Amino acid sequence: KALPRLKQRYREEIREALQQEFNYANVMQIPGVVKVVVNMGVGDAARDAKLINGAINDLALITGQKPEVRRARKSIAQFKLREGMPIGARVTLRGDRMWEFLDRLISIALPRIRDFRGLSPKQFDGTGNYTFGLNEQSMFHEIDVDSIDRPRGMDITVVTTATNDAEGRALLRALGFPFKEN
RNA sequence: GUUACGGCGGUCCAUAGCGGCAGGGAAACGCCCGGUCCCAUCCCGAACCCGGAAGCUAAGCCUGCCAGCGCCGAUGAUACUACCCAUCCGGGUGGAAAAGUAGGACACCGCCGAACAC
Ligand SMILES: [Mg+2]
Ligand SMILES: [Mg+2]
Ligand SMILES: [Mg+2]
Ligand SMILES: [Mg+2]
Ligand SMILES: [Mg+2]
Ligand SMILES: [Mg+2]
Ligand SMILES: [Mg+2]
Ligand SMILES: [Mg+2]
Ligand SMILES: [Mg+2]
Ligand SMILES: [Mg+2]
Ligand SMILES: [Mg+2]
Numbered sequence: 001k002a003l004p005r006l007k008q009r010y011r012e013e014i015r016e017a018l019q020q021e022f023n024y025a026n027v028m029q030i031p032g033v034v035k036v037v038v039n040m041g042v043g044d045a046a047r048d049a050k051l052i053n054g055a056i057n058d059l060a061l062i063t064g065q066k067p068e069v070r071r072a073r074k075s076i077a078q079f080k081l082r083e084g085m086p087i088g089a090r091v092t093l094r095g096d097r098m099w100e101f102l103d104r105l106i107s108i109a110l111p112r113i114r115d116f117r118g119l120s121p122k123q124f125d126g127t128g129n130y131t132f133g134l135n136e137q138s139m140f141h142e143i144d145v146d147s148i149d150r151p152r153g154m155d156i157t158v159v160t161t162a163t164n165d166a167e168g169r170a171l172l173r174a175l176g177f178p179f180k181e182n
Numbered sequence: 183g184u185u186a187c188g189g190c191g192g193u194c195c196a197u198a199g200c201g202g203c204a205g206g207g208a209a210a211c212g213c214c215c216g217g218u219c220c221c222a223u224c225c226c227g228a229a230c231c232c233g234g235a236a237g238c239u240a241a242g243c244c245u246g247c248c249a250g251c252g253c254c255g256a257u258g259a260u261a262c263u264a265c266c267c268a269u270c271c272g273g274g275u276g277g278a279a280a281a282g283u284a285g286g287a288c289a290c291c292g293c294c295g296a297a298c299a300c
Contacts, residue, residue: 028213028238035228059225066225092226095216163240 004099006175014174022167031128031162031171036098038063040153041088046081055089055152061143062154063101067091105156109139110178118180121169128160128168 015030024030038059045052052069059067068090075082093101110116114135124130137154138145158177162168173179 024240026238026240029240063225068225070224090225092228094226094228097226161241 004096004103006099006103014171017174018167018170021170031160031167033098033102034159034161036093036101036159037091037131037157038093038101038155039067039088039090040155042152043087045085045087046079049086051150051152052086052089054149058137058143058152058154059089059091062140063091063093063097065091065097102158104140104142106175106177108141109156112139116178118178120180120182124165124168127164128162128172130159130168130172131155131157 010032015027018024018030019027022029040055042051042055056067056069069086070088070090071084072081072087073083119132123132133153134156137152138148140154158172160168160171162171
């Protein structure tokens with residue numbers, strides 16, 4: 001008896017706009033958002049693993065669901081890194097959690113970005129895939145500024161079912177993230 | 183019996199694989215919707231699983247065509263070798279490669295089950 005507003009927008013106007021504007025053979029060739037992954041790797045756990053717990057707490061307040069601790073598959077003596085330490089965090093947003101998190105991002109963080117000039121179009125890899133990395137991590141309203149001790153990382157990732165770059169452009173612009181103009 | 187239909191299997195498992203080009207939703211096969219209850223995430227209904235058919239053959243799958251790449255492969259020749267003669271030098275009988283070549287080539291078959299007909 002509940003349905004997110006962005007999902008509603010997608011199922012009412014976005015899909016029909018895409019369908020009419022590229023003239024697909026069928027209807028479900030509409031691209032769709034697939035998965036939302038949120039994570040970051042501190043890298044200094046090789047010296048101190050205490051801040052991993054702080055990163056876990058930060059992720060917990062950001063997504064609301066418990067993160068992960070994963071190791072390194074290779075050993076780098078130059079980085080004083082061997083297999084077995086936990087290196088970063090991991091969590092994934094899926095379904096209603098995708099839609100709520102995308103809402104929260106687009107409506108709270110992007111307007112607030114310090115010195116926001118938009119995002120370029122040229123960071124796709126030819127099939128509409130996009131993961132990337134941000135100036136400051138305390139940006140969401142769900143986290144408080146008084147309790148932070150050091151700048152760490154955090155994640156906002158959107159991906160598509162898109163076959164190539166054309167519908168990637170189309171659907172990302174229909175959804176409306178601050179794309180630059182060149 | 184027919185079908186552009188799904189399962190279980192075969193063969194000294196690529197003549198059967200990869201890629202490109204077209205077509206399919208009657209039932210089925212898929213994608214799909216949402217997590218009250220079984221069940222689970224080293225997080226997440228992603229996977230498994232729970233409940234249904236609003237929607238769709240585009241992927242998957244199948245069928246058909248392409249020699250683009252892979253694959254199989256002669257007859258004949260060459261290398262090798264078992265045995266024996268010939269004062270070193272060499273020859274006679276038997277077996278016959280590998281590579282390459284003309285070409286072949288976009289699998290075949292068995293048992294049940296789905297729609298139509300008898
Ligand atoms: Mg893609
Ligand atoms: Mg039907
Ligand atoms: Mg689901
Ligand atoms: Mg198709
Ligand atoms: Mg397909
Ligand atoms: Mg070969
Ligand atoms: Mg072949
Ligand atoms: Mg011969
Ligand atoms: Mg003798
Ligand atoms: Mg002699
Ligand atoms: Mg031969």
